DNA sequence: GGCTTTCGTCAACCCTTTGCTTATCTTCCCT
DNA sequence: AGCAATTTAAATAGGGAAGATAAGCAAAGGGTTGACGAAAGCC
RNA sequence: CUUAAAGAGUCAACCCUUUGCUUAUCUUCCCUAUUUAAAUGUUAGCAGCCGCAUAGGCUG
């Protein structure tokens, strides 16, 4: 829905890599609006366990499992552009 | 790519105003460079330069004489003379509200950097003076030169120190060009052969006579280059600005 | 053998009476 | 139950008086802030 | 680990008294405020009488 926003000046000064910047993306960058009903916001039911959802999750997870070996052979520039394409397709869907 | 943390409105009182034998007033840049390396030691954040400005500063005393300190009988062996007043050695005292801006290089979040600087400043002592109060320090970064000026203008309001150099000597130009003199460092005279009465026995010690440079006070926004206000330890047993002599 | 107390020793001025700087501000533009 | 119209011009000038004085007293204090050297009891 | 490290300036108060800022003034002349126009917006929500009604109907 929206990208995380980093207010931190040292983090904005230094962070460059993919995960090394992503570890600085916290809940306070827009997601944590006011925070008084957090315990109700994290008590969760598990009614998704159905037939077609579980097989779709399994087939896509194994697809990722089989292709993630080429992901580590990518460069920083690739990872950023590929994940931008993935985010654009995800909001499209 | 530069990173700074600014502590604004550092109200400090009890400052040892005796900068040297011939300078009494604002503490020199050797004091604030010493404060910077003090945090490099206690907090571990290694500090290149410090830009310090004076919001307020009053030397205790009149316009021609400083208020001397009533000494206490603290030496050993002069009991019996303790009923009379202790003799006064000259140490002027002063109060000062300062604004400090430390060049640091940091790799963690700004909150733990602010907390480390706050925990240092709560146990620090500006020029022998107890830090009465200080605002919460804030981190600002100088990516480019416009960002350097952003950090510069974030110390408003304060009168920072810019180096204007020595032409012939200190007294002559202080009358002629009317600039202020202060300790930019020290000159080593003799090696000290007795380390028994010192802080460390292994750190090499020298008797020193303070060298002085001539400086001016300019408001931090009116300073064109922030490197001319950031004092740092130069390799001539002195301190110096990054931008050199202010023109 | 230092060691710590108290008493004796040695001096002598020509002053002057605020500024230092002086604060972080909108044109294009299209949505 | 809000509606109250538009432009146009607002004076040119001549003067802002000098002469007097602006006290003389008397006060304005010092009191502590001495380290080396030398006798001289004392562990 | 910053000419680091350390330090009680205390006290006291009679500014007095006196007073002549007076004097004379010409503001003054001048002159076009002119011309319009729907108050509309239903512009009123009444008078009796048929009734227990301050429910509901009728009469003009």
TrEMBL record, chain A:
It comes from the Viruses. This is Uncharacterized protein. The chain holds residues 187 to 279 of 930 of the full protein.
TrEMBL record, chain B:
It comes from the Viruses. This is Uncharacterized protein. It comes from Vibrio phage ICP1_2004_A.
């Amino acid at each position: 829905h929206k990208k995380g926003l980093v207010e931190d000046p040292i983090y904005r000064a230094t962070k460059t890599m993919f995960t090394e910047t992503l570890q600085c993306v916290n809940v306070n960058g827009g997601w944590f609006n006011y925070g008084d009903n957090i315990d109700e916001c994290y008590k969760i039911d598990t009614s998704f366990i159905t037939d077609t959802y579980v097989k779709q999750l399994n087939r896509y997870r194994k697809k990722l499992l089989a292709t993630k070996h080429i992901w580590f052979t990518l460069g920083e520039d690739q990872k950023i552009a590929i994940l931008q394409e993935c985010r654009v397709a995800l909001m499209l869907g | 790519m530069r990173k700074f943390i600014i502590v604004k409105n550092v109200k400090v009182d009890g400052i040892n105003a005796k900068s040297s034998d011939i300078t009494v007033g604002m503490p020199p840049a050797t004091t604030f460079c010493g404060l910077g390396e003090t945090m490099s030691i206690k907090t571990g954040i290694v500090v290149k330069a410090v830009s310090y400005g004076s919001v307020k500063f009053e030397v205790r005393g009149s316009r021609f004489n400083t208020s001397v300190t009533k000494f206490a009988w603290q030496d050993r062996g002069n009991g019996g003379k303790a009923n009379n007043n202790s003799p006064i050695q000259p140490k002027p005292l002063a109060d000062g509200v300062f604004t400090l801006c430390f060049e640091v290089e940091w790799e963690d979040c700004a909150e733990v950097l602010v907390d480390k600087v706050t925990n240092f400043i709560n146990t620090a002592r500006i020029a022998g003076g107890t830090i009465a109060s200080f605002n919460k320090p804030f981190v600002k970064v100088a990516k480019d030169a416009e960002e350097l000026a952003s950090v510069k203008n974030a110390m408003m309001p304060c009168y920072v120190v810019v180096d204007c150099g020595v032409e012939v000597n200190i007294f002559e130009d202080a009358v002629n060009r009317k600039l202020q003199p202060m300790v930019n460092g020290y000159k080593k005279l003799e090696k000290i052969v007795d380390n028994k009465h010192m802080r460390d026995k292994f750190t090499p010690a020298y008797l020193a006579t303070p060298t002085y440079t001539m400086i001016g006070y300019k408001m931090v926004s009116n300073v064109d280059n922030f490197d001319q206000a950031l004092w740092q330890y130069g390799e001539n047993t002195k301190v110096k600005t990054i931008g050199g002599i202010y023109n």
